[PDB]
Design a binder for this molecule. Structure first.
Ligand SMILES: OC[C@H]1O[C@@H](O[C@H]2[C@H](O)[C@@H](O)[C@H](O)O[C@@H]2CO)[C@H](O)[C@@H](O)[C@@H]1O
Ligand SMILES: OC[C@H]1O[C@@H](O[C@H]2[C@H](O)[C@@H](O)[C@H](O)O[C@@H]2CO)[C@H](O)[C@@H](O)[C@@H]1O
Length: 179
């Protein structure tokens, strides 16, 4: 048993009652779906390639909707805490369980990401991905910031939290701020 969050009666994986999420890492260089770069260009601000930022699965990104530009949850922050688990063959156990806060600045669409981001309802509606998680967080890794955490697709618990001050200030520059 590599996955430590066990499915509840509705199939949703949890760990001591808290909901779990799967995670992956990505590199693509795009500005992304919250507009965190210069208007009209596909160029991200450097901080949006360097900091702890995430592309959640589509139905969380837009709070049940399908908009892939200025989703409802752009600019939210989530605290992810490793459980020690992982999907066998698709991750590993991390060296510690320090929690890390990430800011939503992009989206992981269902199309082309069915295994991890193919979840057909928002959290709380008992819809899960193919590995049993109600939400997925794809972590930006342009500058190796996920490797610096030594995270290889860890299973995590997840919660929304207020953003740290520096990430709030960064988000103010994104086009979707106040949309
Ligand atoms: O589709 C989500 C995300 O997947 C990333 O690839 C995963 C891959 O699915 C998994 O089998 C392997 O173990 O890990 C990699 C890295 O997390 C891919 O890099 C992303 O572009 C994609 O958005
Ligand atoms: O990059 C600006 C462009 O972002 C689009 O979102 C993409 C994002 O670029 C990509 O990194 C991620 O993997 O997929 C999302 C969703 O397809 C956004 O949809 C566009 O409106 C925007 O112009």
């Amino acid at each position: 048993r590599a996955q430590l969050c066990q499915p509840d009666a509705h199939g949703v994986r949890r760990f001591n009652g808290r909901p779990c999420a799967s995670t992956t890492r990505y590199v693509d260089g795009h500005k992304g779906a919250c507009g965190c770069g210069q208007k009209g260009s596909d160029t991200p601000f450097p901080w949006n390639l360097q900091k702890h930022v995430t592309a959640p699965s589509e139905r969380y990104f837009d709070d049940g909707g399908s908009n892939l530009w200025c989703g409802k949850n752009c600019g939210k922050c989530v605290r992810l805490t490793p459980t020690g688990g992982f999907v066998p063959g698709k991750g590993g156990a991390p060296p510690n369980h320090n929690p890390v806060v990430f800011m939503v600045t992009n989206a992981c669409p269902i199309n082309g990401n069915e295994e991890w981001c193919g979840i057909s309802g928002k959290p709380g509606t008992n819809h899960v991905n193919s590995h049993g998680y109600e939400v997925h967080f794809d972590l930006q890794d342009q500058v190796g910031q996920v490797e610096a955490l030594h995270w290889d697709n860890p299973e995590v618990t997840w919660e929304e939290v207020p953003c740290p001050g520096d990430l709030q200030a960064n988000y103010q520059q994104c086009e979707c701020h106040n949309s």
